[PDB]
């Protein structure tokens, strides 16, 4: 019984770190463009650019 | 009188000079670039106030 069980529990755990991975994966993305927001919100904030520019 | 021609046209291009130069389409000497702030720095509230003048 413990043998079988123990089995299913590494697979149950496998696809629990694999639900981690592909959630990580999504948050990778998600700081990539939240990073380029905050470089272009800079660029915004410089005087020299006009209305149009922002 | 003859004089005073050169000096009425000469005030008139110092006029011109001053609501003409402008950067990409924002002026510089008309008097409407006040202050303004250039961020100058990698986080917030890092920039420098350059004021232009009429």
Same mark, same amino acid.
Do not use: C, H, P, Y
């Given at each position: ?54 | ?7 009425? #046209? ?7 000079? #001053? ?27 890092? #920039? ?7």
């Amino acid at each position: 019984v413990q043998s079988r069980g123990l089995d299913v529990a590494v697979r149950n755990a496998n696809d629990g770190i694999s639900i981690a991975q592909t959630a990580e994966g999504a948050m990778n993305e998600t700081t990539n463009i939240l990073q380029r927001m905050r470089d272009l919100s800079l660029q915004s904030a410089n005087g020299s650019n006009s209305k149009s520019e922002r | 009188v003859a004089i005073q021609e050169e000096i009425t #046209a000469l005030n008139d291009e110092l006029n011109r000079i #001053a609501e003409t130069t402008s950067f990409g389409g924002n002026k510089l000497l008309n008097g409407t670039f006040s202050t303004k702030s250039f961020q100058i720095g990698a986080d917030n509230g890092e #920039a420098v106030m350059l004021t232009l003048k009429d």
